[PDB]
């Protein structure tokens, strides 16, 4: 993976690529790495794919129950505290590297969590195998007092750096914008700069090409 998070004027934006690998093989060409913990708290996840999904859902479930219990909108620091204490407990064996962001009654927030359970704070962050390509772009172009449209541009550019230059990242750019006072907008496949070109040939076979030994109707009914 490649994932990023960028803070701006009235909120925070996160983004991610959409490649999933198994060694040198691309397992999924359009997987979703942007995860919803609560309506206005979203998580970008790198590392062990199942771990990022499972840990995000578990905390997301407990956050929802907590929100119902307290009659309050959940806070990013609650998700941050719950995630880090869970990850720390497992001493890194749950290989989840997360960028946690969102807006809540306290304000807008941006954090990162490592598998062993350490957390950072920042205005711009990047995690994953393409984080160095992304961080290079962020360090070059980031500034204080970014607008919404500037932050999305910066974020997607940082993801693109990973897509092109990192072999562990590719395909498309997902974005999620969390602005204060507004609904969070999830932009699935915000950019699709890796569309497959038209194939040279149709490999549709003449019917009867495959040799068959037996046929039978399968009963799916009761």
């Amino acid at each position: 993976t490649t994932i990023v998070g960028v803070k701006f004027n009235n909120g925070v934006v996160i983004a991610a690529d959409t490649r999933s690998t198994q060694g040198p093989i691309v397992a999924d060409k359009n997987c979703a790495k942007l995860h919803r913990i609560s309506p206005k708290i979203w998580c970008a996840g790198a590392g062990t794919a199942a771990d990022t999904e499972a840990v995000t859902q578990l905390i997301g479930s407990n956050i929802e129950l907590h929100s119902l219990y307290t009659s309050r909108e959940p806070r990013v620091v609650s998700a941050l505290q719950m995630l880090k204490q869970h990850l720390f407990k497992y001493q890194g064996h749950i290989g989840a590297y997360l960028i946690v962001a969102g807006v809540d009654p306290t304000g807008s927030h941006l954090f990162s969590i490592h598998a062993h359970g350490s957390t950072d704070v920042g205005y711009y962050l990047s995690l994953g195998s393409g984080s160095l390509a992304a961080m290079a772009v962020l360090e070059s172009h980031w500034k204080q007092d970014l607008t919404k449209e500037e932050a999305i541009k910066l974020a997607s550019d940082a993801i693109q750096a990973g897509i092109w230059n990192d072999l562990g990242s590719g395909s498309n750019v997902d974005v999620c914008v969390m602005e204060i006072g507004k609904d969070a907008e999830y932009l699935r496949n915000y950019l699709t700069p890796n569309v497959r070109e038209e194939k040279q040939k149709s490999y549709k076979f003449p019917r009867g090409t495959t040799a068959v030994l037996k046929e039978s109707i399968v009963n799916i009914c009761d």
Binding site: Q85, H114, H116, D120, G122
Partner: protein, 196 residues
């Protein structure tokens, strides 16, 4: 890390760099290694970021619960709770913590807790990978009952050298001043300290 805490006339000052590393990559160049466990009891964190964080959070919880029952805890008490965690979990921890706090009775106090979980009360303490390079300098330059400005210069010059030689240290020099007046945060940027 390069971290240090120094007692002086009016109280105590904590100092730290801002570099976090994953190998030779700098994961965070603006880290805050000075963390509040109580109003006027702070600690400098070195070693594993995850371990020191988890410990600091538990200590902060213990001292908040202490305060709810028995009022303000002493700096010694805070260091004892750190020690208890670091000593009893020595096999599973990589944490070198300096505890510093201001009482009105005891004034400034500094306790250092190395890997083993032993406690050592000192006039000043240095720790982290970059501390090795300034043992010579700090010993020669430290004086008891320094002023605030002198102690700030002592820490600034010290961590400047630690940062210069240690690759695992760098970024900004954060400081936290603990006195009867209150709590003051200071920051010093490369363009100032590098050319000392």
């Amino acid at each position: 890390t390069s971290i240090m805490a120094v007692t002086f006339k009016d109280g105590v000052i904590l100092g730290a760099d801002s570099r976090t590393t994953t190998g030779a990559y700098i994961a965070n160049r603006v880290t805050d290694k000075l963390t509040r466990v109580h109003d006027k009891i702070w600690c400098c964190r070195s070693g594993s970021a995850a371990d020191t964080q988890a410990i600091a959070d538990i200590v902060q919880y213990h001292l908040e619960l202490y305060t709810s029952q028995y009022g303000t805890p002493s700096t010694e008490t805070a260091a004892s709770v750190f020690k208890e965690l670091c000593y009893e979990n020595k096999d599973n921890l990589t944490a070198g913590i300096i505890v510093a706090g201001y009482d009105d009775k005891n004034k400034g106090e500094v306790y250092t807790i190395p890997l083993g979980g032993s406690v050592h009360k000192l006039p000043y303490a240095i720790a982290g990978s970059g501390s090795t390079f300034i043992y010579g300098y700090c010993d020669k330059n430290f004086r008891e009952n320094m002023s605030k400005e002198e102690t700030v210069d002592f820490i600034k010059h010290s961590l400047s050298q630690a940062i210069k030689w240690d690759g695992s240290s760098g970024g900004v020099i954060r400081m936290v001043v603990l006195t009867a007046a209150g709590v003051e945060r200071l920051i010093f940027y490369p363009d100032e300290y590098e050319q000392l």
